[PDB]
Design a protein around this ligand. Structure first.
Ligand SMILES: CCCCCCCCCCCCCCCCCC(=O)OC[C@H](COP(=O)(O)OCCN)OC(=O)CCCCCCCCCCCCCCCCC
Ligand SMILES: CCCCCCCCCCCC(=O)OC[C@H](COP(=O)(O)OCC[N+](C)(C)C)OC(=O)CCCCCCCCCCC
Ligand SMILES: CCCCCCCCCCCC(=O)OC[C@H](COP(=O)(O)OCC[N+](C)(C)C)OC(=O)CCCCCCCCCCC
Lengths: 70, 55
């Protein structure tokens, strides 16, 4: 089921009577970024989403330096 | 002594399972009716613009 594009997923579930290919130009979404081919759910594969922290550590350790005494 | 139906009439229903055959007949009527099943994932149930799913 995840192979269905998000454009037609809403139409299949009787969410609207206007298919995405019949959409008015003003009703379409405007993307400033390029569009790629539809990617289905990637579970049970090597492409599964891997969560990670998007923030740096909250404390930075001291970079050690040596100064010779007089 | 105050029954409206005669003993023979009450026995005929009781011995011949009058209401049981009535219940069987109603169940058989649905056998010749259209079912409700939809063929997911080839078909989807109704959705509304207010529906809450993945963020
Ligand atoms: C597989 C093989 C076949 C198997 C199935 C065989 C089917 C044949 C069944 C034969 C037996 C059936 C008997 C039916 C006649 C007797 C029943 C009857 O008439 O009623 C009993 C009667 C009492 O009178 P009552 O019923 O109370 O009427 C007033 C109610 N408002 O009582 C009387 O007044 C008379 C007493 C009865 C006399 C006849 C016995
Ligand atoms: C021929 C062999 C196959 C059927 C054998 C069994 C039939 C019923 C025997 C007892 C009847 C009885 O006792 O009749 C009496 C009852 C109820 O009527 P009441 O309450 O007196 O009505 C009130 C008085 N009126 C008559 C003025 C209105 O009738 C029934 O509920 C009939 C059941 C019909 C539906 C099922 C029939 C098909 C069965 C499924 C296929 C096998
Ligand atoms: C001379 C002619 C002989 C007829 C032969 C057939 C007789 C059948 C039995 C009649 C008595 C009876 O069903 O009795 C009902 C009994 C005991 O009921 P009780 O505790 O006495 O209450 C009732 C008496 N009242 C009202 C005075 C208090 O329990 C039951 O509900 C049994 C349910 C069995 C259902 C099986 C049906 C399966 C499908 C069959 C159709 C294809």
């Amino acid at each position: 089921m995840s192979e269905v594009e998000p454009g037609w997923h809403y139409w299949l579930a009787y969410g609207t009577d206007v298919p995405p290919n019949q959409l008015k130009p003003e009703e379409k979404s405007v993307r400033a970024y390029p569009v790629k081919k539809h990617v289905p759910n990637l579970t049970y594969t090597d492409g599964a989403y891997v969560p990670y922290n998007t923030a740096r550590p909250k404390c930075a350790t001291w970079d050690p330096k040596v100064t010779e005494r007089p | 002594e105050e029954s409206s139906e005669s003993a023979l009439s009450k026995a005929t229903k009781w011995y011949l399972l009058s209401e049981i055959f009535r219940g069987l007949y109603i169940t058989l009527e649905m056998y010749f009716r259209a079912p409700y099943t939809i063929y997911y994932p080839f078909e989807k149930g109704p959705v509304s613009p207010r529906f809450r799913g993945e963020h």
